[PDB]
Amino acid sequence: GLFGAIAGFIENGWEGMIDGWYGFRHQNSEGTGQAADLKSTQAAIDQINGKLNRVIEKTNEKFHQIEKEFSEVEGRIQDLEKYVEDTKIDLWSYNAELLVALENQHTIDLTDSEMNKLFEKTRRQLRENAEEMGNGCFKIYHKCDNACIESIRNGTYDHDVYRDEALNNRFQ
Amino acid sequence: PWVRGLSSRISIYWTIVKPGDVLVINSNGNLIAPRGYFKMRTGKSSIMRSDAPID
Ligand SMILES: *[C@@H]1O[C@H](CO)[C@@H](O[C@@H]2O[C@H](CO)[C@@H](O[C@@H]3O[C@H](CO)[C@@H](O)[C@H](O)[C@@H]3O)[C@H](O)[C@H]2NC(C)=O)[C@H](O)[C@H]1NC(C)=O
Numbered sequence: 001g002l003f004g005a006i007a008g009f010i011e012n013g014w015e016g017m018i019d020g021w022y023g024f025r026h027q028n029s030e031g032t033g034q035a036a037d038l039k040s041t042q043a044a045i046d047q048i049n050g051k052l053n054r055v056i057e058k059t060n061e062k063f064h065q066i067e068k069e070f071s072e073v074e075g076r077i078q079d080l081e082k083y084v085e086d087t088k089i090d091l092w093s094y095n096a097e098l099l100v101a102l103e104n105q106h107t108i109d110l111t112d113s114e115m116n117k118l119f120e121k122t123r124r125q126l127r128e129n130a131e132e133m134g135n136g137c138f139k140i141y142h143k144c145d146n147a148c149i150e151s152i153r154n155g156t157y158d159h160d161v162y163r164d165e166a167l168n169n170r171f172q
Numbered sequence: 173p174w175v176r177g178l179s180s181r182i183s184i185y186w187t188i189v190k191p192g193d194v195l196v197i198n199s200n201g202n203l204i205a206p207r208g209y210f211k212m213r214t215g216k217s218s219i220m221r222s223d224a225p226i227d
Pocket residue numbers: 173174179
């Protein structure tokens with residue numbers, strides 16, 4: 001979309017992430033695993049919720065509606081009755097087809113933002129100890145265990161502890 | 173044209189009487205008198221032309 005993470009710099013999507021909408025996949029000294037990031041999978045679902053809910057309540061309740069089908073030819077009063085309704089109809093149909101088209105474009109772009117948002121949340125945590133490869137993947141520049149991967153994902157990473165370890169791997 | 177034996181017709185009219193107004197019927201032939209009045213509520217009631225069974 002606009003932000004160009006999804007269907008963009010992130011090649012494609014994980015058909016085998018089944019506990020969330022956004023997340024991480026590691027390869028470290030201890031092996032290979034994956035986790036959903038919840039906070040973001042919530043805020044993306046929480047707007048769509050509101051949005052849907054907003055689109056819905058709304059139901060035309062009035063008032064002794066005029067006759068709409070006709071069993072004679074009557075010329076003018078009828079000719080108007082039909083054209084009043086015929087016209088109304090075309091309006092709502094447009095009114096509708098715009099809404100869905102609008103909403104979606106946005107639903108699509110907000111879900112895109114949420115990804116790029118989670119990309120930049122990570123980047124800032126790993127202050128100096130990694131570098132963006134551009135396929136939505138970092139290359140951390142130190143040794144990091146399952147306990148350190150899971151420490152990144154739950155907000156509690158400590159750039160300074162693996163700082164010195166990080167810079168030697170990058171530059172020398 | 174012939175319909176149920178007859179080729180005569182009746183033509184049906186209405187008249188609303190407001191509260192405080194007065195009806196006065198006057199004729200010298202061919203009247204189909206009313207017998208009284210229907211009450212006139214007014215609210216969300218209406219009619220539809222269906223053929224689907226009520227359930
Ligand atoms: C003026 O002419 C009209 C016809 O153009 C006459 O109306 C016709 O009246 C005759 C005589 O009663 C009707 O015959 C009937 O036929 C039905 C058929 O189903 C039958 O049930 C009866 O046994 C009866 O014989 C006929 O229906 C009717 N024609 C039309 C087209 O409505 C009328 O009588 C004439 N009036 C005068 C004052 O001359």
